[PDB]
Each structure stands twice: as structure tokens, then as C-alpha cells.
Amino acid sequence: QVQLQESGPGLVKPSETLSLTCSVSGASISDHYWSWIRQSPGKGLEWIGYVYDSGDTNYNPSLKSRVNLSLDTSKNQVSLSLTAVTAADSAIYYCARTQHGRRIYGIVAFREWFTYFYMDVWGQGTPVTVSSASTKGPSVFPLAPSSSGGTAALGCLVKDYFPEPVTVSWNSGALTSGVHTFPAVLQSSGLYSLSSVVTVPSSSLGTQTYICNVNHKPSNTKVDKKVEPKS
Amino acid sequence: AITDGELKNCSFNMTTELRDKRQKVHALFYKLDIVPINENQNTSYRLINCNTAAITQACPKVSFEPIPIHYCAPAGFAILKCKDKKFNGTGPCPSVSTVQCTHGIKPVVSTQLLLNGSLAEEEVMIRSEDIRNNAKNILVQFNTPVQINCTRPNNNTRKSIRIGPGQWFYATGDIIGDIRQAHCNVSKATWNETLGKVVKQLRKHFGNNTIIRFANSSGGDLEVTTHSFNCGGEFFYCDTSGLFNSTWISNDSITLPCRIKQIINMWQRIGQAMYAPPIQGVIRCVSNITGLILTRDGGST
Amino acid sequence: CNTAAITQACPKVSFEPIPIHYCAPAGFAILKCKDKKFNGTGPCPSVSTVQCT
Amino acid sequence: SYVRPLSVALGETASISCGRQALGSRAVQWYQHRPGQAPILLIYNNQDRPSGIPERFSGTPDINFGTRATLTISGVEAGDEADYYCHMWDSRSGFSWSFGGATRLTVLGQPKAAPSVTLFPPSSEELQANKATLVCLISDFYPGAVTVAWKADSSPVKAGVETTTPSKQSNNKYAASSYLSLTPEQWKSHKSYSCQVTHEGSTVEKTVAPT
Ligand SMILES: *[C@@H]1O[C@H](CO)[C@@H](O[C@@H]2O[C@H](CO)[C@@H](O[C@@H]3O[C@H](CO[C@H]4O[C@H](CO[C@H]5O[C@H](CO)[C@@H](O)[C@H](O)[C@@H]5O[C@H]5O[C@H](CO)[C@@H](O)[C@H](O)[C@@H]5O)[C@@H](O)[C@H](O[C@H]5O[C@H](CO)[C@@H](O)[C@H](O)[C@@H]5O)[C@@H]4O)[C@@H](O)[C@H](O[C@H]4O[C@H](CO)[C@@H](O)[C@H](O)[C@@H]4O[C@H]4O[C@H](CO)[C@@H](O)[C@H](O)[C@@H]4O[C@H]4O[C@H](CO)[C@@H](O)[C@H](O)[C@@H]4O)[C@@H]3O)[C@H](O)[C@H]2NC(C)=O)[C@H](O)[C@H]1NC(C)=O
Ligand SMILES: *[C@@H]1O[C@H](CO)[C@@H](O[C@@H]2O[C@H](CO)[C@@H](O[C@@H]3O[C@H](CO[C@H]4O[C@H](CO[C@H]5O[C@H](CO)[C@@H](O)[C@H](O)[C@@H]5O)[C@@H](O)[C@H](O)[C@@H]4O)[C@@H](O)[C@H](O[C@H]4O[C@H](CO)[C@@H](O)[C@H](O)[C@@H]4O[C@H]4O[C@H](CO)[C@@H](O)[C@H](O)[C@@H]4O[C@H]4O[C@H](CO)[C@@H](O)[C@H](O)[C@@H]4O)[C@@H]3O)[C@H](O)[C@H]2NC(C)=O)[C@H](O)[C@H]1NC(C)=O
Ligand SMILES: *[C@@H]1O[C@H](CO)[C@@H](O[C@@H]2O[C@H](CO)[C@@H](O[C@@H]3O[C@H](CO)[C@@H](O)[C@H](O[C@H]4O[C@H](CO)[C@@H](O)[C@H](O)[C@@H]4O)[C@@H]3O)[C@H](O)[C@H]2NC(C)=O)[C@H](O)[C@H]1NC(C)=O
Ligand SMILES: *[C@@H]1O[C@H](CO)[C@@H](O[C@@H]2O[C@H](CO)[C@@H](O)[C@H](O)[C@H]2NC(C)=O)[C@H](O)[C@H]1NC(C)=O
Ligand SMILES: *[C@@H]1O[C@H](CO)[C@@H](O[C@@H]2O[C@H](CO)[C@@H](O)[C@H](O)[C@H]2NC(C)=O)[C@H](O)[C@H]1NC(C)=O
Ligand SMILES: *[C@@H]1O[C@H](CO)[C@@H](O[C@@H]2O[C@H](CO)[C@@H](O)[C@H](O)[C@H]2NC(C)=O)[C@H](O)[C@H]1NC(C)=O
Ligand SMILES: *[C@@H]1O[C@H](CO)[C@@H](O)[C@H](O)[C@H]1NC(C)=O
Ligand SMILES: *[C@@H]1O[C@H](CO)[C@@H](O)[C@H](O)[C@H]1NC(C)=O
Ligand SMILES: *[C@@H]1O[C@H](CO)[C@@H](O)[C@H](O)[C@H]1NC(C)=O
């Protein structure tokens, strides 16, 4: 029972110092390894570096010059720093618990053994987009139900914003059935737009006070909106 | 690749069947068979023998395994065999018999350690030409044989590259599988037991009680410093520091590092070197260590 | 050139076969079967002895 | 560099070869990666499967050299479809920083699912903001390949149309959405607006009109 949470900014200007944080809850940070992995669309996932428990570190030869790792003993937090970020450095960032492995193929005395690592427990991953563009708050407009029995459809609209992602809940997470949050779409304007609908019975419709809760961390804006039929 | 190399991957041009044509071939070599042609250093290497003597490739059909050979004397002569169990180096042999030919003597070429020999009967024998003189070596013969296992785990390959009309050169082919170095094993229980039986007979000539230590070879180089021998066609050179590393007064098998060469000059031969063609597959030979060859350090102790 | 080397036969030596007699050493002898109709093997009724063929 | 494709019939076992084959003794890790989600390793040491992994996945144990590290998946299903990476650690090669080239596993014979389309007219609050957007939502359709054509009455719009590429949801079906940006005056002028979604040979159309 180990859980990892990556808290990142989600947006950083190019040629700046990107930073993240890997909080751990399962066990102490001084008994296992901690490694960061980044996955960008169109490119295979990339192992950048692990973290000793003490906390020497090795880094991938490609990013060896621009990355610095660190582990906090007071707080089970694995911090990752990265300098001279560009548009390519944008990708989903993971931090996983790595375990030590020792493969023996010959006689131990004469070396003949290599260490092999494997990450058994992963975090959820926090996205990070690097671009000069500024932040933009999302416009939330309710989608009125269309009015056979007894299925009915309502939802909310999240107009142009930036950057990904956006979290959508209903009644502060009170309703989970029939909830479908579709992926956003990037318009030529450069801002994403996503929708989120809920399928509720005709009956219930009248009145249950359905409200969608929207949140956009980079914009620092948390918005709620009511949804009700319109004449 | 590897970070923090006994064998090396060598490329070089070699003549072909036709005089005008040449060919570039790559073949693996051992570090000992090669020296750098620069020392400044660059990294062009050459064979260790090219500077001193020519070289010839041992035919691949002939085998180097010693077989029992009987030395016979012509008619009118005879051979007298001393059947005295406790017979030392020289002296009067009370029990004598006559034979026309000797027993099956295997011509095992070894160093430091005697292999496949005949075991002394009754007690172990300590034979020398002058025990008082340190300069003369000391022959030891075991009554109980110790077992030694030498292997070359590398799954080498034979690359047959023609270098002329009819001439064929057999080069090493990239190794298949892990890269492990050759080594021999000896049971520590038996060797410690056999070594103790030796010190008992040693004290019979150096006082019933005295300090008897063992150290590694500190003189000479190459052949004299390593337990050299042949095994399946490959010439091994092992470090024996692990066996002669004790001090005597009043299943956990030992392991020995062994390096290999393919260019050799045996019996102090000056002028002709031999290239041992690579042996395909894994090599493993179990041999009997029946005798030893020791020497005192001397001094004013 | 692909299989084996090559050597040039000296020009003085001749390849013409000349009569050669195979002789046996003292203490041995050669038995010649003088049976006209003598086939491959079998008992030869008429036998003579010679030192060389 | 880029991914290599593999195709398997549904319910039939499949073998996934591993690129950059090992030179010596090896310990291989097989990772399962879904786009947007966290990678889950199936095999940490050739034949060792952490707790929770189903027994259907298996890998080849290097007992005698010459064997090729492969990933075997029995009872191939929708959830198996993904990208599989082969992390190689052999005795001859050094530190292996990079994972293997991705292997895109696709499951054939999956049952097609008709798309569920829901067209939403622009909200009154968007009209007060002097902007208008028609929102066409498509859910639970396989295979994830659709074309969206908008129409006005009869005429097609062909302008101001933005559509997401289909994405797989937890139902193992795809989901796509299309957005038509309009001016409030253009929304009131026409009688009705229609969203046409074509999936395989079928086509479903939904219509909405101003109040
Ligand atoms: C002369 O003298 C020399 C010196 O005395 C002598 O040197 C010896 O040479 C031989 C070869 O010549 C060497 O043999 C090899 O040894 C390897 C290691 O063996 C030991 O260690 C392993 C691993 O131990 C860890 O893991 C086990 C497994 O879970 C744990 O239980 C342990 O607690 C331990 O974990 C702790 O320690 C780790 C540090 O290592 C930590 O990281 C960890 O966190 C923990 O703290 C043990 O498994 C071994 O025990 C078993 O095997 C031995 C040896 O046979 C048996 O005696 C014993 O009864 C057990 O059955 C042992 O303790 C071997 O792994 C190796 O065999 C592997 O490699 C070969 C070739 O690469 C393969 O063909 C073979 O199949 C083996 O691979 C299997 O395992 C690997 C890794 O697990 C897999 O990746 C692979 O897919 C394969 O899986 C298959 O087998 C598995 C088990 O075998 C099985 O589970 C799978 O399901 C699958 O079927 C090889 O035997 C030896 O090391 C040298 N010794 C020394 C001291 O140097 C020389 O031989 C002498 N002879 C001469 C000169 O002729
Ligand atoms: C001190 O004394 C110790 C006690 O003897 C010594 O220990 C000896 O160590 C040597 C090695 O140094 C061993 O010799 C080698 O053993 C190899 C392993 O043997 C296995 O295979 C045997 C095959 O079985 C046959 O023979 C047995 C004999 O009784 C018989 O019962 C059986 O029915 C069958 O006919 C098996 O019996 C064993 O139990 C083992 O499992 C062996 O492979 C070696 O043979 C090689 O190499 C030698 C020398 O290089 C050649 O003379 C051989 O012809 C053979 O080479 C051919 O085969 C190779 C196989 O890979 C090829 O690579 C070669 O190229 C070659 O192939 C060519 O030639 C073939 C024949 O013409 C052709 O058919 C091919 O097409 C190719 O053209 C070798 O014998 C001793 O075995 C071992 N002793 C004992 C008792 O085991 C110790 O070495 C001594 N120490 C010192 C310092 O001297
Ligand atoms: C490696 O070393 C071991 C060390 O013992 C060695 O094993 C012994 O070999 C000898 C032969 O050299 C064996 O002795 C013979 O055994 C046979 C079969 O039992 C007997 O027929 C023989 O009897 C006679 O010959 C003796 C002289 O050898 C005479 O003393 C006697 O009067 C008989 O005429 C003979 O006893 C011996 O049995 C083995 N030891 C064991 C435990 O088996 C082994 O041969 C060595 N390996 C190699 C490759 O040389
Ligand atoms: C082997 O034993 C013989 C005994 O017969 C030794 O011969 C004697 O050796 C001593 C000194 O070691 C001399 O003083 C005697 O004169 C020798 N006697 C004869 C008849 O020669 C011989 O020295 C022993 N050899 C070894 C190496 O110990
Ligand atoms: C050494 O390597 C050779 C390969 O060159 C192995 O020979 C192969 O063995 C397999 C059996 O697993 C056969 O299927 C191949 O046909 C063989 N090929 C050749 C060219 O021989 C040999 O088994 C290896 N030996 C060891 C001890 O690892
Ligand atoms: C050298 O190798 C031989 C055989 O390869 C070993 O003899 C084996 O010893 C074990 C006990 O440890 C027995 O169980 C086997 O039956 C023996 N095999 C044979 C063929 O006799 C010997 O122990 C090895 N010696 C060392 C020092 O490693
Ligand atoms: C091999 O031969 C070619 C052509 O003769 C020559 O240009 C090259 O320098 C040679 N290389 C080596 C390493 O001898
Ligand atoms: C002998 O032993 C010494 C250790 O005292 C070691 O440094 C040296 O390399 C050894 N030399 C040989 C030839 O064994
Ligand atoms: C001799 O044995 C000692 C004690 O075990 C060990 O420290 C040392 O490395 C050995 N030296 C050699 C040359 O084997």
C-alpha cells in the first residue's frame, strides 16, 4: 500500500527552471529508490534518473547536464529540477518507486554480475506544458437538457482555456453514475475546450439541482454552475 | 561495451588467395598476444612475436593430449625399476626389478603443479638434489591425488579465413554469450589436508618443529610465475597465489584466475613461436594434481 | 588457387615409366603363379620362386 | 524511434518479440503502457509477475542461452491493447537507460459499437456573451474512426468545425466531440442545425433548432 502524488506547475516558460515534487505515503523515502519518467506524445517514455535513499543520483546521459534531483528526509518528497526547458521538454511526468536488482551470471568474485532496476509502483503523473503563451481562464456555460422515457441528458461546457488539464466534478463529486467527461479539443486559437455531460432519468429531472464543479489549476480558478431546463 | 578488458577486437588487412587481392577481416585476440605499436600511444597493435621470431599455426587435426608412452631399451640393455615405496631421490634401492620398457608415462607439460603424474605409494615423497641448497628445486609427490577443474566458460567460435592458395588461418570468432574468464577449482578441504601432509614430511628435513610458510612465486615472469599447462588445445596460465598462501607451526572450493594465450614459446624455444588455433565451444578438463615443484627463498634467516 | 597451392614440375625429370623390379630382402621370397588360366584368387597349381618381379 | 505494430485475433494468444536482443545473460522487464495513463510492469524478472498481474501474461526464462525474450499474452482481449516496452539488461551491454521501441498491440475481431450522438444547442449565457458554439458529442463507438460533417438545413457548413481525434475510454470504446463556432446572429437566422456522424457504413444525424 504505497501511493505517490506528483504536484507540478503544469505550465513553465521556455528557458526556465522547471520543477516538480513527488510526495510519498506508503513507506519512508530512505528505504527504496525513486525514479522520474517523462512521456511525451509521439515519443517513447524516457527514463531520466533515479534517486538513492541517501541520495546520490545518476542521470540519463542525454539530460545529465540539465537535471538535478533531490530527496527530502523530513518530508517524503522527491523533487526534480530541470533547466533550459523548451517545447520538447513538455510531457507527462511520472515518479515511481524503483527496486534494486542483482543478476549473477558467472562467479561472484570476478564481478560477472550487473545490477538491474525495475519500478513496481507508479504515481498518477502530472502534465507539464512549456510555452510562452500565458494562462487563460475557462468560460463555463451550462448545457440545457434536450427534454423516450425516461433517459435525459444535461451537461456543462468549458470554453477556451490554457493549458491542460481541467478537472470536472458534479455536486462536488456527489454524483458519479452516468458521468462522461470528453477529451478537450485544441482550436486554432490555441486554447482547449472540453465538455462534460451526465445522463439522468427523465423523472429525477425535476428537481434535483445538478451543478457541475470546474477547476483549472494554472488559471487558479474554481468555478461552479447550475444546470436547469430553459423554455 | 563495458565501463571500468583481457581480450580485444582487432581489425586488419590480410592477403587473400590471389596475390593482387587483399581482404579486411576482424578477429578477437587476447591481451597477452598483442602489444601496442606506439606507446605514445595511439592505438594500433601488433602481435607480440613479430619482433623476435616468426610464427607458425599448429595444424588443427593434431591433438595435444598426452597419451601413455613407454620408453624401451634395445636388446642387450635393460631397465632397472626401483620398487622401494619409501625410496627418496638417490641412494641404494633394496628392492630392484628389471623390465624392458617403462610404465605408461604421460608427457604432461606443466609448471608449478604436477598433473596426471603417478602417485607415490605409502607416505608422500620429498625429492631434491640438495635439500641444504636452496637453488635446487624440490620435487613433491602426493600419495592422495587432489582434483582440479579448469574451464573456459566463453563459447568461442572458429573463423576460417583463407590467406593464400591452400593456406588457411583460423581466427577467433566473436564470443557467443557472457564474457567470463577461465579459472580452475580445487577443494579447500583436500588441499588443506594434502598441504598438511606435506609439511609433516617437510619438518623431517628442517627440524621436527619449525616455521613453514607458503608464498606466491616472486621470480621470473610469464611461464614460471603461472601454473601453465594445456587443456583441450587452449594454453592456460593460472595464478597460484591462492594455493600457496599459508603459514604452518606446531564445498568451499578454492578458485584460481587463469588467463589464456595463443602465441607461446615453450621449453625456452628461441626463434619459433606457435599459434594455438581457437577451440570451438566451451572447454573443461578435469585433471589430477599429483606432484609439486617448490623452492626456498634463501637468505640469512 | 582456391583449394591448394601449386608447384611447377621440374623440366628435367621425365614422366615416362621404365621397368621397375620389386625385390624382397634376404630371408623372404616372392612366389610367381605361372598358371596361364589363373583367375583372381585360388590355388595355383604351377608355382615358382623369384627374388624380384 | 517510433512504434512497431502487432495485430492479434481476439481470444487467441500472442507473442511479442523484443527488439535489441541480448548478447549475454539477461533480465528483461515488460511494461504495459496505455496513452495518458501510468505504465504498469507485467514482468520484472523474466518470469516474475508482481502481485495482482493475471497469470495469462508470461515471459521466457533465460535458462539456456540462445532463447529470445518474448512476451506471451493468452486470451487476448480489449484491455490488452496498448503499447508494450521491453527493457533489456544483458551482461555484455552496459547500463540500459532507454526502454525498448514501443510495440503497438491491436486486437482484431472486436465487436463494433454504434455511436451515441448528443447534439447540444448553444447556451443562453453564451449568447449573452455574443458568441455561439454547437457541441456534438459522440460516445461508445468502435472502431474508433468517425467523420463529422455539419449541415445547415441542407447546406454544409465546412467552416468553424473543430473535431477531436477519437480517444479510448474505460469502456474500451472510443469517444469523440466536435465543436462548431458560430455568431449568435447566424444561430438565430437558420431554421435548424444538424450534426452528421458517419461510423463505418452507417450515419447518424441529430438536429437542434433555436427557440
Ligand atoms: C568454481 O568455484 C566458483 C566459486 O565457488 C564457482 O562460481 C559459481 O559459478 C556458477 C556458474 O559457473 C554461478 O552460478 C550462477 O549463480 C547464480 C546465483 O545463484 C545464487 O544466487 C541466486 C539468487 O539469489 C537471490 O535470489 C534468490 C531467488 O529469489 C533469493 O532467494 C535469494 O535470497 C537472493 O536474493 C537476495 O540476494 C540478492 C543478491 O544476489 C539481493 O538482490 C536480494 O534482494 C536478496 O537480498 C539463487 O537463486 C541461487 O540459489 C539457487 O541456485 C543455486 C545455484 O544453482 C543452488 O545451489 C540453490 O540450491 C538454489 O536452487 C544461488 O544462491 C544463478 O542464478 C545462476 O543461474 C542463473 O543463470 C544461468 C545463466 O545465467 C541460467 O541458465 C539459470 O537459469 C539461472 O537463471 C535463472 O534465474 C535468473 C535470476 O533469478 C532469471 O533471470 C532467469 O530467467 C532464470 O530463471 C529460471 O531459474 C530460476 C532459478 O534458477 C527460477 O526461479 C525461474 O522460474 C526460471 O526457471 C548460476 O547458477 C555461481 O553464482 C558461482 N558462485 C560463486 C560463489 O561465485 C564455479 O561454479 C565453480 N565451478 C567450476 C570452476 O567449475
Ligand atoms: C590430464 O588427464 C585428464 C584425464 O583424461 C585430462 O582430462 C581430459 O581433458 C581433455 C581436454 O583437455 C579431454 O579431451 C577432450 O574432451 C572433450 C569432451 O569429451 C566429451 O565428449 C566425449 C565424446 O564421446 C565419444 O568418445 C567417448 C570416449 O570414451 C566414447 O565413449 C563415446 O562413445 C564417443 O565415441 C564423451 O565421451 C565425454 O564423456 C565428454 O562428454 C572432447 O569433445 C574433445 O574431443 C575433441 O578435441 C580433441 C582434441 O582437441 C580432438 O582430438 C577430438 O577429435 C575432438 O575434436 C573434434 O570434435 C570437437 C567437438 O566440438 C570439434 O570441435 C573438433 O573440431 C573436432 O571435430 C573435427 O574432427 C571430428 C573427428 O574427426 C570430425 O567428426 C568433425 O567433423 C571435425 O572435422 C577432447 O577429447 C578428455 O576427454 C579429458 N579426459 C577424460 C578422461 O575425460 C586432462 O586434460 C589432462 N591434463 C593435461 C594437462 O594434459
Ligand atoms: C586420477 O587420480 C585417481 C587417484 O586414485 C586415479 O584413480 C585410480 O587409478 C588407478 C589406476 O591408475 C586405479 O587402479 C587400478 O584400478 C583397476 C580397476 O579397479 C585395477 O584393475 C588395477 O589393479 C591393478 O593395478 C594396480 C596398479 O594400478 C596394481 O597395484 C595391482 O596389483 C593390480 O595389478 C588398479 O588397481 C584406481 O582404482 C583408481 N582409484 C579409484 C578410487 O578408482 C585416476 O585414474 C586418475 N585419473 C586419470 C585420468 O589418470
Ligand atoms: C636419499 O637417501 C640417501 C640415503 O641412502 C642419502 O644418501 C646419503 O646422504 C647423506 C646426506 O644427505 C650423505 O652424508 C651420505 O653420504 C649419503 N649416502 C650415500 C650412500 O650416498 C641421500 O642424500 C638422500 N637424498 C636426498 C635428496 O635426501
Ligand atoms: C555455443 O554456441 C553455439 C552457437 O554457435 C551453440 O550451438 C547451437 O546450439 C543450439 C542449441 O541450443 C542449436 O539449436 C544450434 O543449431 C547450434 N548452432 C551451432 C552453430 O552449433 C552451442 O550450443 C553453444 N554452447 C554452449 C555451451 O552454450
Ligand atoms: C570437479 O568436477 C568434478 C566433476 O565435474 C566434481 O566431482 C563431483 O563432486 C560432487 C561432490 O561435490 C559429486 O556429487 C559429483 O558426483 C562429482 N562428479 C563426478 C563426475 O565425479 C569435483 O567435486 C569438482 N572439484 C572441484 C574442486 O570443484
Ligand atoms: C586496409 O586496406 C585498405 C585498402 O588497401 C586501406 O586503405 C586501409 O588503410 C587498410 N586498413 C588497415 C586498418 O590496414
Ligand atoms: C604475489 O603476491 C603479491 C602480494 O603480496 C601480489 O601483489 C603479486 O601480484 C603476486 N605475484 C604473482 C606473480 O603471483
Ligand atoms: C592470502 O590469504 C589472506 C588471508 O585470507 C588474504 O587476505 C590474501 O588476499 C591472500 N593473498 C593471496 C596472494 O592469495
Residue numbers in the entry:
A (entry chain H): 1 to 82, 82A, 82B, 82C, 83 to 100, 100A, 100B, 100C, ...
B (entry chain G): 137 to 140, 152 to 186, 186A, 187 to 309, 312 to 321, 321A, 322 to 397, 411 to 461
C (entry chain G): 196 to 248
D (entry chain L): 6 to 67, 67A, 67B, 67C, 68 to 95, 95A, 95B, 95C, ...
Paper text:
The final outcome was that the BG505 SOSIP.664 construct was modified by nine substitutions in V2 (K169R, Y173H, S174A, R178K, V181I, Q183P, G188N, N189T, and E190S), a seven-residue deletion in V2, six sequence changes around the CD4bs (S199A, N276D, T278R, N386D, N462D, and T471S), and the E64K and A316W substitutions for stability. Here, we sought to investigate, at the atomic level, whether the 17 amino acid substitutions and seven-residue deletion in the GT1 trimer perturbed its structure compared with its SOSIP.664 prototype. Guided by the 3.0-Å crystal structure of the BG505 SOSIP.664-N137A trimer, we removed the PNGS at position 137 (via N137A) from the GT1 construct for crystallization. We were then able to determine the crystal structure of GT1 at 3.2 Å resolution. A structural alignment of the GT1 and prototype SOSIP.664 trimers showed a Cα root-mean-square deviation of 0.28 Å, indicating that the gl-targeting design changes did not substantially alter the native trimer conformation. Of note is the extensive electron density for W316, which was introduced to decrease V3 mobility and increase trimer stability. The side chain of W316 could possibly adopt more than one rotamer (which is difficult to define precisely at this resolution) but is clearly positioned between the side chains of R308 and Y318, providing a possible explanation for how it stabilizes the V3. A slight conformational change in the V1 tip might be attributed to the deletion of the N137 glycan, as previously observed. The N276D substitution also allows formation of a hydrogen bond (H-bond) with the antibody TyrL91, the T278R change creates an additional contact with SerL28, and G471S appears to have a stabilizing effect on the V5 loop by a facilitating a new intra-gp120 H-bond with Thr455.
The envelope glycoprotein (Env) on the virion surface is the only relevant target for bNAbs and, hence, is the main focus for antibody-based vaccine strategies. The Env spike on HIV-1 virions is a metastable complex consisting of three gp120 and three gp41 subunits associated through noncovalent interactions. Soluble trimers of the SOSIP design that faithfully mimic the native spike have yielded valuable insights into the structural details of how Env functions and the bNAb epitopes it presents. Here, we describe an engineered trimer variant, BG505 SOSIP.v4.1-GT1 (gl-targeting trimer version 1), with improved capacity for binding gl-bNAbs that target the trimer-apex and the CD4bs epitopes.
